Amino acid sequence: GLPTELKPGTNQFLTTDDGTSPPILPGFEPTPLIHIPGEFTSLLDLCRIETILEVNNTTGTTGVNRLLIPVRAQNNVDQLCASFQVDPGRNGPWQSTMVGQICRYYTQWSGSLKVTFMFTGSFMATGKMLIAYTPPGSAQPTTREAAMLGTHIVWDFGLQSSVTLVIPWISNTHFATGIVTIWYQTNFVVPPDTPSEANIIALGAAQENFTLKLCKDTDEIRQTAEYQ
Amino acid sequence: GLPTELKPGTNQFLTTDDGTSPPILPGFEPTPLIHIPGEFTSLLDLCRIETILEVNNTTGTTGVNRLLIPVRAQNNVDQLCASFQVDPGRNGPWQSTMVGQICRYYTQWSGSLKVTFMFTGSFMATGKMLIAYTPPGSAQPTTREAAMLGTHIVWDFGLQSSVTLVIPWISNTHFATGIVTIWYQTNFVVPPDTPSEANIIALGAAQENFTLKLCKDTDEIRQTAEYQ
Amino acid sequence: GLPTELKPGTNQFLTTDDGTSPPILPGFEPTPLIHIPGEFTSLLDLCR
Amino acid sequence: VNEASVEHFYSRAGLVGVVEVKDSGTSQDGYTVWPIDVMGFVQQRRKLELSTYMRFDAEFTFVSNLNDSTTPGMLLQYMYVPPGAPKPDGRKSYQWQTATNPSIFAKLSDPPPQVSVPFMSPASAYQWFYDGYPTFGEHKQATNLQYGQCPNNMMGHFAIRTVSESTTGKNVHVRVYMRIKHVRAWVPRPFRSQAYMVKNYPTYSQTISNTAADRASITTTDYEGG
Amino acid sequence: VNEASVEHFYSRAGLVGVVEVKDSGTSQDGYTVWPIDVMGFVQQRRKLELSTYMRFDAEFTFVSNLNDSTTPGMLLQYMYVPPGAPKPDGRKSYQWQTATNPSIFAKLSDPPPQVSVPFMSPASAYQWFYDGYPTFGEHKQATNLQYGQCPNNMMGHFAIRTVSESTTGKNVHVRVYMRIKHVRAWVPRPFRSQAYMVKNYPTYSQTISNTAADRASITTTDYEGG
Amino acid sequence: AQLTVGNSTINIVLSYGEWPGYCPSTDKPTRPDVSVNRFYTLSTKSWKTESTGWYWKFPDVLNDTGVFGQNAQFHYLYRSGFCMHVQCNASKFHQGALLVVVIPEFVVAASSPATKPNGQGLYPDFAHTNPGKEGQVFRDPYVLDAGIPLSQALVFPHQWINLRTNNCATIIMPYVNALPFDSALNHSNFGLAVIPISPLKYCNGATTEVPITLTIAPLNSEFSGLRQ
């Protein structure tokens, strides 16, 4: 008979327990699987997809204009164009990325990000911007010459339409992290009878080594209305 | 189905039982181990470390002066310098050793102790002390000549700065044990323009065969205040 | 899961039952045996 | 890498719906049906809408007690009405007996009941995004009602009664916990960026909540965040 | 030699904290959170401070009953709020449902509940001695508050409620027993030689308790001890 | 009878029996080698009769000093060990003993001022937590400015300086932490305490101050995240 003895974990319903349950319909044979294209087994595969990053979140801007940042003819030299944090968890531009929404279901993440820029101006326009990355523990560079120092890429409109910047060794673990500034290197050169104002689009995504842990529930969906 | 029958040990929570419990977070992967120097798997490794033994516990003495015992120029011969029990469990000098604190979490111990002395006087000073050990069941030696008999070591300041004395076959089991006396063998010899008063430091530790059993809870931490 | 069913001998304390019980002190190592002369395993040896 | 799986992302049984069997007040008809919506609470509604297609088995658990938290050994009946069957009209209705209509008899005093529901859809997977119309009923003038609704997603019902001839004076509160298991998903979607309004329809309002927060200027990151 | 192991020295689950769910008096809001301090009682605070670094899994047990010792089959809910989540503001708060927030439903009449918590720290081991400051907040004038505090040691919370819509008139007393298991330790320390004062800070007083006892003279061992 | 590293000129206790190495490629940092690897000889402490002792915080003491101090206050992450050499210049006519002890994660404490309910927050000031290059004096050396007793401090890596015996001591400390890298500015890994167990004594006509000297060499340093 093998007499047993009950233990303190008896009569206990633990919501996270993976148990075994009797099927209510035995012998019921569900519909067989037909091949459906595009299954995804992991969320990391959804993190590696570049999605638009809304760098113009300023109060006045509404609509799709939020998704793009202006460049124009400057009457001043070496001015700053745009700046944004590198933190995908915090409230800010990264809330619009798929990475920023998918890392708000988790407590901790670590890995590298990449941020791609794309220039939508006319084919005849030329110029240079300076895209600088500032590591943690440092403040935002005051002037371009301070940003000209390490971890920058000077990017020419004529040669390439797109450019990429990788962000190393990101982690949130705690309880200023990272800043990417875009500087006017030269000026916005234009021929006659062509627009003098263009736009830049910022894309961002995780890379291979990015990871997530300790799934939690998101705070964006609160929605106190009980009718939903 | 293998019908079983419950036994009298059922629905029983025994605090010392080592059981099995469902993890509340399944699939949670904790941080991996990085090599950290200085792990210790046993308390015996902490017993073998020589720690200071406070032989001057007299009421008047305060501060670090408790940790050292005076020697000086004696106007009398063969006088007794200092004496202390060998019992690490009892209240006394051994409370300051790591062995004496770590054997107060256990009911019974057995093994050998060693007691090292170190002379802090000047390099020019010389002399001899007589360090005698008295086995259990005997009283403290009255005079030096009684102590000159077995289990003693005569120790010269000039030749060696340190000396060691091993204590055999100690056990507390029960319900006078051991005494170590330090005698002036000769006198404290000193040249001109050098201090005539020095100090001796007593160290003590367990040896390899020392063991402990039946862990209990210490009485030093009582601290009736409930704010802690 | 191997679903079982309880029987009528359940929740029963029988004083002559030889069971199994959890040790209250695990890892406690009792004093080892020294040879003691004159052990007796049976009462018949005392009857003779 | 394992904690980011879709298998792990959909795990950990949550509270699906609460239901109250009412014998007490003006009602005095003990029983309730319950639809098995799975999208009832708005927060799990997002996570499921992450994909277009889903195939999973469900495990239901029933936690029950009284107004005050007490467990005086009543008997209940958990009637699972599969899709395409009728629903009890009353407590003594003839449909509580039947067969082919699985029941669970469990006393409150017991541990909570536990059952698994297989994948019941006629198609190969569930879909909560169905473009187009289920049927031909059409000369509609303009009637847009049934757009987007799909019949294929209906999973069962649960009916619970107190198994008593006479009217009891007790109200029983039942919490339903469902655990998705053996899950596959297809065709990822974006997360819902607006507030939900109606249960079954993806309608939003004309005041458009911005996807991200706001800040002072595109240059300065100083106050609040952005 | 086995009974002196650090594995054996940290074993044998002790009483960590007691907590009282109060429905009775002026309070009448049944629920409590509890921090999971593990250092709450001064006597286990020493044994843990023996080392600098610790890595272990914990096993919690909940012993519950009424004012008088009675067990009238209520239902409770043991909500484990892991580190970095929010805490229930009330008994009907929306955070009692959620998911990813493990719960235990157990009736008082049952055996006590039993759960295991893995090693949750971001670092490789716990440390109760952290020299320096957690953050850069600094222009402090002189404000020394956060010295020595480390964020990495926070383990969860437990929230318990009575699972009742209306206010019960019962007070439930919950004892929490934790069993350290699979323990490793690094960098031994000395034992605390003074009396503890504040919970989180290693502050002592200006009247210095001697480490050993006292006696008459350094020679004579006669009366009392020394 | 001398040894030189990087144009810097001037038995051994190896802490926890492990020699400091670099971390592996896992589990691109900059390795300065002999540029920052050299002997930093800081100021000299005059040891007197009735002196309580001194202590330091080692990532902290070099923050303001030299090249290592430059990299420390600009790179975001830090890892290294230390080779620490404490010399004492005395004469055959002086007597005394020093206990040199390396306390990992040494956390200073504050003392409650005698009569008070003692519930209010008390806390060591920033001078005592980060003494800098000048070190800091024990107000209460018997408890080590913490709760732990001095007599048990021998459990840490230590060495004795007994003036009649050797006048020098050398302790090699590997990197000890719960993380592979850490912040040099905020976090202090350990500290030295030089404590005169047996007080200093001499006779009239001799030198009152005896000059304790401290010399510290970083070992296998590596840095990450260089800011401006």
Residue B55 · residue B63 · CB < 8 Å: no
Which of C40, A9, A60, E215 shows the shortest CA–CA distance to B12?
A9
Sequence-separated (6 or more) residues with CB below 8 Å from residue E145:
F121, F123
Q: Give residue B71's identity as a one-letter amino acid code.
A: V
Contact between C9 and B8 using a beta-carbon 8 Å cutoff: no
- Residue F179 is classified by DSSP as S
Sequence-separated (6 or more) residues with CB below 8 Å from residue F162:
B118, B120, B161, F97, F98
Residue A175 · residue A116 · CB < 8 Å: no
Longest dimension (CA), chain A: 97
Which of F69, F63, F61, F150 shows the shortest CA–CA distance to F103?
F150
Of D102, D187, D188, the CB nearest to A25: D102
Write the secondary structure of chain A as one string of H (helix), E (strand) and C (coil). Answer: CCCECCCCCCCCEECCCCCCCCECCCCCCCCCCCCCCCECCECHHHHCCCEEECCCCCCCCCHHHHHEEEECCCCCCCCEEEEEECCCCCCCHHHHCHHHHHCCCCCEEEEEEEEEEEECCCCCCECEEEEEEECCCCCCCCCHHHHCCCCEEEEECCCCCEEEEEEEEEECCCCCCCEEEEEECCCCECCCCCCCCEEEEEEEEECCCCEEECCCCCCCCCCCCCCC
Ramachandran bin of B157, using left for φ above 0, alpha for ψ from -120 to 50, beta for the remaining angles: alpha
Type and span of the H or E element at D8? helix D6-9
Contact between B29 and D2 using a beta-carbon 8 Å cutoff: yes
Contact between B93 and E212 using a beta-carbon 8 Å cutoff: yes
Strands of D75-81's sheet, edge to edge?
A: D32-34, D157-161, D75-81, D103-107
Chain centre distance of CA F124: 19
Ramachandran bin of D132, using left for φ above 0, alpha for ψ from -120 to 50, beta for the remaining angles: left
What pairs with residue B217 in β-bridges? none
Q: Could you tell me where the DSSP H helices lie in chain E?
A: 6-9, 42-49
Assign domain D1-226 to a CATH class: mainly beta
- For residue E104, the chain A residue with the least C-alpha distance is A14
Taking the C-alpha atoms of residue F154 and residue F146, their distance in angstroms, rounded to an integer, is 15
Sequence-separated (6 or more) residues with CB below 8 Å from residue C14:
none
Taking the C-alpha atoms of residue C21 and residue C31, their distance in angstroms, rounded to an integer, is 21
Which of F143, B119, B82 shows the shortest CA–CA distance to E215?
B82
Sequence-separated (6 or more) residues with CB below 8 Å from residue B118:
B161, B162, B200, B201, B203, F97, F160, F162
Residue E53 · residue E79 · CB < 8 Å: no
Residue B51 · residue B205 · CB < 8 Å: yes
Sequence-separated (6 or more) residues with CB below 8 Å from residue A100:
A88, A89, A94
Which of D58, D111, D54, D65 shows the shortest CA–CA distance to D82?
D58
Residues from chain A contacting residue C19 (CB–CB below 8 Å): 3
Taking the C-alpha atoms of residue F129 and residue F106, their distance in angstroms, rounded to an integer, is 10
Radius of gyration of chain B, Cα coordinates, nearest whole angstrom = 25
Chain centre distance of CA E64: 17
Extract the tokens encoding B1: 């189905």
Extract the tokens encoding B203: 């160290």
- For residue B198, the chain F residue with the least C-alpha distance is F95
Nearest CA distance, A21 vs chain C (angstrom): 9
Ramachandran bin of E10, using left for φ above 0, alpha for ψ from -120 to 50, beta for the remaining angles: alpha
Taking the C-alpha atoms of residue E61 and residue E114, their distance in angstroms, rounded to an integer, is 5
Contact between E164 and D68 using a beta-carbon 8 Å cutoff: yes
Which of B147, B153, B148, B155 shows the shortest CA–CA distance to B127?
B155
Taking the C-alpha atoms of residue B81 and residue B184, their distance in angstroms, rounded to an integer, is 7
For chain E, which residues make up each domain, given as ranges?
A: 1-226
Extract the tokens encoding A175: 């309880």
Taking the C-alpha atoms of residue F74 and residue D108, their distance in angstroms, rounded to an integer, is 65
Sequence-separated (6 or more) residues with CB below 8 Å from residue D199:
A228, D37, D39, D40
Method by which the model was determined: cryo-EM
How many domains does chain F contain in total?
Answer: 1
Contact between E8 and C27 using a beta-carbon 8 Å cutoff: yes
In order of their start, the domains of chain B are 1-228 (2.60.120.20)
Which whole-number Å values give the CA distances from E142 to E145, E146, F123, F127, in the listed order?
9, 12, 10, 10
Experimental resolution (Å)? 3.0
Chain centre distance of CA E77: 20
Q: What three-state secondary structure class fits D12?
A: coil
The number of beta carbons lying within 10 Å of the beta carbon of residue D30 is 22
Q: What three-state secondary structure class fits F207?
A: coil
- Which residue range(s) make up the domain with F183? 1-228
Residue E97 · residue E75 · CB < 8 Å: no
Taking the C-alpha atoms of residue E220 and residue B142, their distance in angstroms, rounded to an integer, is 11
Pick from A17, A172, A175 the residue to mutate for testing the E interface (most E CBs within 10 Å).
A175
Residue indicated by tokens 């590997």:
F174
Taking the C-alpha atoms of residue A56 and residue A60, their distance in angstroms, rounded to an integer, is 10
Strands B80-85 and B179-184: antiparallel
Which of A96, A16, A9 shows the shortest CA–CA distance to A52?
A96
Q: For chains A and C, count residue pairs whose Cβ atoms are closer than 8 Å.
A: 4
Of D43, D44, D69, the CB nearest to E163: D69
Strands E204-205 and F111-112: parallel
Write the secondary structure of chain B as one string of H (helix), E (strand) and C (coil). Answer: CCCECECCCCCCCCCCCCCCCCECCCCCCCCCCCCCCCECCECHHHHCCCEEECCCCCCCCCHHHHHEEEECCCCCCCCEEEEEECCCCCCCHHHHCHHHHHCCCCCEEEEEEEEEEEECCCCCCECEEEEEEECCCCCCCCCHHHHCCCCEEEEECCCCCEEEEEEEEEECCCCCCCEEEEEECCCCECCCCCCCCEEEEEEEEECCCCEEECCCCCCCCCCCCCCC
Contact between B98 and E116 using a beta-carbon 8 Å cutoff: no
The C-alpha angle A13, A16, A22, rounded to 5 degrees, equals 60
Taking the C-alpha atoms of residue D5 and residue D108, their distance in angstroms, rounded to an integer, is 36
Residue B67, φ and ψ in degrees, nearest 5: -85, 0
Residue indicated by tokens 């008459």:
E216
Which whole-number Å values give the CA distances from A64 to A67, A90, A182, D125, D208, in the listed order?
6, 21, 21, 35, 12
Residue A73 · residue A186 · CB < 8 Å: no
Which of A138, A86, A131 shows the shortest CA–CA distance to A112?
A86
The number of beta carbons lying within 10 Å of the beta carbon of residue B166 is 10
The DSSP result for E104-115, as a single string, is EEEETTSPPPEE
Ramachandran bin of D224, using left for φ above 0, alpha for ψ from -120 to 50, beta for the remaining angles: left
Question: Going along D35-156, which residue ranges are E strands?
Answer: 53-65, 75-81, 103-107, 114-117, 126-127
Exposed, middle or buried, A135 (CB in 10 Å: 0-12/13-18/19+)?
Answer: buried
Q: Could you tell me where the DSSP H helices lie in F56-148?
A: 58-61, 66-72, 126-129
Taking the C-alpha atoms of residue B47 and residue B69, their distance in angstroms, rounded to an integer, is 23
Chain centre distance of CA F85: 10
- Residue F116 is classified by DSSP as S
Taking the C-alpha atoms of residue B162 and residue B158, their distance in angstroms, rounded to an integer, is 10
